[PDB]
Amino acid sequence: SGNKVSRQSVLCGSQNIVLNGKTIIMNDCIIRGDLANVRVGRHCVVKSRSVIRPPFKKFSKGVAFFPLHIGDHVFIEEDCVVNAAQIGSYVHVGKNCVIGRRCVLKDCCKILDNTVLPPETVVPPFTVFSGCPGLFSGELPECTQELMIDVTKSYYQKFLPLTQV
């Protein structure tokens, strides 16, 4: 009900796909859950041109990859190729980002713009991601990240209300 899905956005595999309350799918989004399921958290803002593709078929005899996930208050930036990443709640994904195979994003993370998280890259909680090759830039503040996520959730709710159908 509360989830504002855009008209230009596409959600392939509706049974596999999953959208929590107060969600926001921007225009030209692609939540392709044909092969596997895609779980979106509450108050999660998926920005425009975001390719939400399923990680694996989940039909492998041994060591099948985890399909998709997204914690609450997840600020997914525009043009972000989210694939096979278990995003912890309050994860701030950067613009033009790229998630790897079975990448574990921790709580209160801050992915930089134009980043590339590699396969099986376990990011630590309260830490800014940086570099061309994934690495720890520095420890992030708890109060500043929570305030920015609250402001982003309020702004997305206003755009969710009007001008989309």
Binding site: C12, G13, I30, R32, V51, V81, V98, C132, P133
Partner: protein, 168 residues
């Protein structure tokens, strides 16, 4: 026939795809300039932009039809605007092929990698994602081992595409 062409995917001009080819959703295959040629078992992922270079000038002709090799794993969001490719070449996501190229067999392009215009990539050499033309890391991508790895990658791609085709 015998190629998984998606409904959302777009094709234009002459385009002869090989056997067991997989065209993913929202994939552009603009072959208006010249007749496109996709190899057998070549997987084109979603949001991919297959372009061609306008060709046939008498003195120093610019290009010819972009011939993709067999078992070529083109990742999602990959640009391939007029680049000659070899068999068993794994182009990563968000990549960009040059205006003219010669990608040899057993390749492995990195993510967010700008492949060179008028540059022939050597046989058996994995490209680092960021700064172009990185010579390092070409041992594990050697002719013998890379052929076995690409055969395993082609099997996983065919198995995943078969599961996707079964789901519909």
């Amino acid at each position: 026939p015998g190629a998984v062409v998606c409904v959302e995917s777009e094709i234009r001009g002459d385009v002869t795809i090989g056997p067991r080819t997989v065209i993913h959703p929202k994939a552009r295959i603009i072959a208006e300039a010249g007749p496109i040629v996709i190899g057998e078992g070549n997987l084109i992922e979603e949001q991919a932009l297959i372009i061609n270079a306008y060709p046939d000038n008498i003195t120093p002709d610019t290009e010819k039809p972009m011939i993709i090799g067999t078992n070529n794993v083109f990742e999602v969001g990959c640009y391939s605007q007029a680049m000659k490719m070899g068999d068993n070449n794994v182009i990563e996501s968000k990549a960009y092929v040059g205006r003219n190229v010669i990608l040899t067999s057993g390749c492995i392009i990195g993510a967010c990698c700008n492949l060179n215009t008028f540059e022939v990539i050597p046989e058996n050499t994995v490209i680092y994602g960021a700064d172009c033309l990185r010579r390092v890391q070409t041992e594990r991508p050697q002719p013998t081992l890379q052929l076995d790895f690409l055969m395993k990658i082609l099997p996983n791609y065919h198995h995943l595409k078969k599961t996707m085709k079964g789901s519909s």
